[PDB]
Amino acid sequence: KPAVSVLTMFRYAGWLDRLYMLVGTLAAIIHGVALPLMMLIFGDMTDSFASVGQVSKQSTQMSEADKRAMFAKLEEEMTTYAYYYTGIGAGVLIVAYIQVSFWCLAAGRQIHKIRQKFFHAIMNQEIGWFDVHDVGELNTRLTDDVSKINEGIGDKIGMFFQAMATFFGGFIIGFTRGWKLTLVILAISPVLGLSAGIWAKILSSFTDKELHAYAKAGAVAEEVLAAIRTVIAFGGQKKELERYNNNLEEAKRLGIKKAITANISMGAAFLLIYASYALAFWYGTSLVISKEYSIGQVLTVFFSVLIGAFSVGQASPNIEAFANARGAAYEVFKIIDNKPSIDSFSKSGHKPDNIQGNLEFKNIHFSYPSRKEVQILKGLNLKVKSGQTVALVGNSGCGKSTTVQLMQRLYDPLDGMVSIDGQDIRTINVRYLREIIGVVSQEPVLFATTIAENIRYGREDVTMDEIEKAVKEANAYDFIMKLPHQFDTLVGERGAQLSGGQKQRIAIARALVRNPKILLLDEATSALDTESEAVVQAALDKAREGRTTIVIAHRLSTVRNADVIAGFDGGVIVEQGNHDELMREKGIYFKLVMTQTPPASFWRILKLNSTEWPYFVVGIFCAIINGGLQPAFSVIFSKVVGVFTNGGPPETQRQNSNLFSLLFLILGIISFITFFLQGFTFGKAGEILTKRLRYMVFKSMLRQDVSWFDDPKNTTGALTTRLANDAAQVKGATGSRLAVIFQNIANLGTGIIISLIYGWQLTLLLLAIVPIIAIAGVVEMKMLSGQALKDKKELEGSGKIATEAIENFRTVVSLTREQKFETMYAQSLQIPYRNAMKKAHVFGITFSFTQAMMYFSYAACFRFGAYLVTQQLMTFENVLLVFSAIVFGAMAVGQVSSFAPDYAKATVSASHIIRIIEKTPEIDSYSTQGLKPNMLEGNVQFSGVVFNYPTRPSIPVLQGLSLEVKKGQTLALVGSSGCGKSTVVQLLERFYDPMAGSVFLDGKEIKQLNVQWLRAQLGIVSQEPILFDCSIAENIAYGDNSRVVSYEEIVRAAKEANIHQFIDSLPDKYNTRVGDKGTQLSGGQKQRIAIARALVRQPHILLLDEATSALDTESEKVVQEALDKAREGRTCIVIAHRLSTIQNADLIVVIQNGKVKEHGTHQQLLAQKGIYFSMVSVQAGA
């Protein structure tokens, strides 16, 4: 919404840039003008043949006489026009190059200046300006915005003025050569713009509908694939598939409806286009019979106006390009034009010498630009004498840090003054101030360069001698020497990750080269290991003694030797003096002292598609007839112009034009039928395989085992995404592109034969030209992408050192040396700049070549078509025929190159979708194998089990685990911590088989048992029960599948689970919708419902996994009450964390590091002492 004045935007264009734009925009206008002049000549040529065509047929008496005057006229005429054509080709060749080159030259030169100035501005902004602004957004704003500006001031403008020139140029020639047809053409203009208007309305509306449609099906999948371990446990995999099939069923019906309407629209649009196109010509013919116009003129005015009309459509996108560019240039220039109060690039202000380092802070009130929300410094008084060292102490706010912040004049104080020596800090030059102040910070930063270089960021002028003494006086010398490469080592975020205490010591070495008179040390010792702290501490102490120093830390070991200690409370200075005095004050200080002591052949996807043997043949057969249909229009138009051109005695003509204009319209309406057909057939074909695929994919996805689902690569979102993209992407490839590609090959193949058989060697020649300009047209786009990529790589490297410069910024300003970063940036950019010059040279040649080739190619059409071919009997009427036939056959092949990528993107998206079906599990619920025992009663035998999780085969959870629990009794399970407790419940459900060892239920091995039937007997109840959206009765009825449960059954279950209080209370009762689409309710109820699911199944085995985990107060009591009523009739394993409620259990078993450590009844473990007595002691006491 905010934008920029048109003249500001060019502020960096002067002299040449200005001139370049003018010569370019000039050349561009000439270029544009060229094309309608070309079409103007086309009417003159028509007239020349037309005269002879009228006289040739007027003879029917003499022959040899016509071999003279006719040929002579054509000779002088044709040679003239051809000469002019060649004349226009050289023109467009020159102006095209001028056009693109100059405008790109302007672009390059300005953007270079935009770029430099911008970064310079960024580095100049005061720190408060950063504190309010997102650095991330700013740098991404840098690279992305300047590119938009580039797109805006580029050759896009040249293209705009070219388009206007064609628009004006066309309409002028249209109007002058006649007023009538132009206004008749202007009359049909609003109709073609309206139909395209119906398109923007249909597309925008229906695009959301399909997205809205699958959003429903994809909502089924998302709650399922998130809830998977629940559907696997309860084996509802046939149900969730059925639901997904139902939603897919609806989505395809909506899809075919959309396919019907969308094809009707496109078909009707093409009718109106061909209708008006034919209508305009009919009025055109009606004016020729009246002898108002030349038949040749009609072609000139008709082509010129329509060309000039479409020029508006082709112009519009460049307006947008310019428009967007201004908007982008607003926020960039805003920073550039902004001027700071503090500068730091300004040469002004006193530069005192023999600074004695006498500091004072007078009555300073300050607030960081969180501003009025908080005031952290209320007044202040502090003096620090020359050569002394003062230590600041505080509980919170770190208002101490503020003074170190103000002392570098990062911020000017609200009221009061900071005074270095006698003078105010605001009188002295900022750069020099920062230079006479050294700084060492809690978190040290190293830029990526040699250690010599990071030490060279203290001062640009330095020698390895000064480096050496610096690190040595920082006692960083010995430790780095041991490091390989010596001072030439590397450092940064990337590579050479080092001890902090060493980094801090390089930082102290850097600050030391600065040889400052004032030293600020903030917490530098803090947040560091105790051993290396003393090492660095030695350095810090050796860094002072030449300098006055203010230091802040939480280490009171480093304070004692300070000549002055100063505490703050609420921004108010309170205590000052020597340590003993402060201890005698027994104040805040004493308080703190005491406190601290890919492409391949995948046919089979098409084989899957072969379920429709028909519908393809219909669409194909239909499209090939539409292929043969398309050039018929080119054949008519040839003979409409042709017979009228070829007419001879006129009396017959006017009747014929009517017949043609009629037939001209007939291919129009027959096209509606054929286009709607092929589109609808493929469309339905697309939606049905969209079902089969998403079905077979989802289905195969339910098959896989928890091993696959625990994977990091596959998370619920990634699967839904994988599920949508692949199905959609194969559809396009089996879809329209194939319909269209076949339409086109038939289009050209029909066009070629007609052209071939009519012209001998007419056509043969043309076919030599077009593929060459087509390939020449493809290779340009290839170079274009190449240069684009290379430029991206070069500015990526410059933008990288930019990001470095502004991400660490608050440090670089503290050291100054922003000019170093200005210069580094400059040199970085100088390569794309030289690259950007070459770019213009190339863009101009390729463009001009492609245009000149098309214009020169045209000359050959008539030169060889006349002369050598028309000297012979072979005739004009067909020359016009072939012209359209081949050229529009080629323009149709152009769609091949356009639809190339959709195939790849579909094949890659296919490459995944074939594999995802054929991947097979270790454990598949689908196999009907397994024993299906007849005997009810469950035991559970765990013997010598070892388990390591497939995702994390590092720390094993289970090592030699052995448990036994008899039927109809409760096995309590205790543990130090972890899934050791819970993994039991997972293995019995057989989400995994163990590495070694085995587990038995009735004494049979589950490993050889039926996976489905096994789970069918289990009473699983987790921490946070997921309930699908549906009737709460349907959530309960999930406890049993392959059968529908009775109302009185799910009643008995709810009665059992004590959830019935709610369920009679609600308006809907059992049909209430839950899952926080229909309704929301707390955990206590959700759990009780899960309890109902569980004992709806009537399991012989209940598994209660940390059931009361998330819960509170009475809810725990009533849920526990329900769980307790749920067991004692059944085998169960309860891993719950309430050991007060485990006190009644048949067998309690302490698990330790995978091995059962203790086991027994409660009092039995109570009699002993060990882990379990401790477990029960701590929490009952806490």
Author numbering: 30 to 626, 689 to 1273
Question: What does the original paper state about this entry?
Answer:
In previous structures of apo mouse P-gp, and also for ligands pertaining to subset B, TM4 adopts a mostly straight-helical conformation characterized by weaker electron density, indicative of regional flexibility.
The transporter P-glycoprotein (P-gp; ABCB1; EC 3.6.3.44) is expressed in the intestines, liver, kidney and blood–brain barrier, and affects the bioavailability, pharmacokinetics and efficacy of drugs. P-gp belongs to a superfamily of ATP-binding cassette (ABC) transporters found throughout all kingdoms of life. The transporter consists of two pseudosymmetric halves encoded into a single polypeptide. Each half is formed by six transmembrane helices (TMs) and one cytosolic nucleotide-binding domain (NBD) along with interconnecting loops and short helices.
